[PDB]
């Protein structure tokens, strides 16, 4: 099925975990989008959000925290869950880039042929941001060996794109499983990843996702 | 809008024309698909057919063999069953290509530069490995549900229409423009106004696409 279950389940675990270990991060999780907000977005972008993505939006419209000054603390080990407004704005942003480009080194994909080998595509809908040009999001125009609505890395520093999940649900869930596995350090602090079981160092979450993907591919 | 109007309009023109100038070809046009046939197909392939494509199917489920000689100047309009069979056929090819002649697009980056894609749904066949059909996974400068050539001899893919409706309509306009010869007989294309020779319809579509691309390139 679509990964709606996983979405719903993940948000339970994430909502619970944040409330327990990091209230301040909890506060930042926004109220649900209404159905009209999302229909308006879908009309604006002329796309159908996959079911799981619509489910996540109907739980949290990204993160906010206006009274903070140092910037928002990204839920995903520093990366910020985007609001529907930001999703629309950035999607149109990247759509302009694709236009300007119609006339960047070599683009590749892991797995091979899973993601279109391009810098920007109109159908790559960003959902998470580093506020530094890079995104996780959902791919609505997969390559030949890709899957519709797979979750991918793309952006400024992602000449190679990685498929990091089959759907948004699986992604949210693996994030939830990291939290529960104790794979975290608080810097009541900034959230960053470490492999608890291996007494591993602090690592950028993107490098973790890329590594995992690579490993999974070779198997 | 979607190109549903154009679909519906085109089939009126095509149904009319065929009945007048080539009854035998008319006979080959099938009864409509039912909505369940389509839902069953959509489940089988796990895709949503574009609206215009669903409209065409609700007029004719392709052509039905007398042996069927192809409506589109020899190319056969596929039945839903053939669409499903061929889509799975092409889907297996992609799978086997994953375990490893330059593929290009006109316009550049409009169509994925690959031999086979799961989301290229064939609608017309060459009975020789080549297709016109609808692209549900466009390139960066493509458009969802644009109509493309693809297949065995299509190392370069061409976007020949913005939607299925526009395609059916341009076919209809060829017929009404007198751009045909009967070999009643077998239907083949000629440019009436240029007193032109007979031409393969794929070459016509390729030239047309190529010209259109080139006339638009000054604009930005």
From Swiss-Prot, chain B:
Domain of life: Eukaryota
Subcellular location: Nucleus
Other noteworthy facts: Present with 5680 molecules/cell in log phase SD medium.
Assembly with partners or alone: Interacts with TYS1.
Function field: Protein involved in the regulation of cell wall assembly and 1,3-beta-glucan synthesis, possibly through the transcriptional regulation of cell wall glucan and chitin synthesis.
Family: Belongs to the KNR4/SMI1 family.
Protein name according to UniProt: Cell wall assembly regulator SMI1
Organism: Saccharomyces cerevisiae (strain ATCC 204508 / S288c) (Baker's yeast)
Classification of source organism: Eukaryota, Fungi, Dikarya, Ascomycota, Saccharomycotina
Shown residues within the full chain: 84 to 340 of 505
């Amino acid at each position: 099925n679509d990964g709606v279950s996983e979405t719903l389940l993940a948000w339970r675990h994430i909502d619970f975990w944040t409330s327990e270990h990091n209230p301040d991060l909890n506060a930042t999780l926004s109220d649900p989008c209404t159905q009209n907000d999302i229909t308006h977005a879908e009309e604006d972008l002329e796309v159908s959000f996959p079911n799981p993505v619509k489910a996540s939006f109907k739980i949290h419209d990204g993160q906010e925290d206006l009274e903070s000054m140092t910037g928002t603390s990204g839920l995903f080990y520093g990366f910020q869950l985007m609001t529907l407004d930001q999703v629309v704005a950035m999607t149109q942003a990247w759509r302009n880039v694709a236009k300007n480009l119609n006339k960047i080194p070599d683009q590749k994909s892991i797995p091979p042929n899973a993601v279109q080998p391009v810098y920007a595509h109109p159908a790559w809908i960003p959902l998470i941001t580093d506020n530094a040009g890079n995104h996780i999001g959902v791919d609505l125009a997969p390559g030949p060996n890709g899957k519709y609505a797979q979750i991918i890395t793309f952006g400024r520093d992602f000449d190679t794109k990685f498929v990091i999940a089959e759907n948004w649900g699986e992604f949210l869930l693996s994030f939830a499983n990291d939290l529960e596995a104790g794979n975290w350090y608080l810097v009541d602090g900034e959230l960053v990843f470490r492999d608890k079981k291996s007494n591993g160092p602090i690592q950028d979450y993107f490098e973790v996702l890329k590594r995992r993907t690579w490993i999974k591919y070779q198997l």
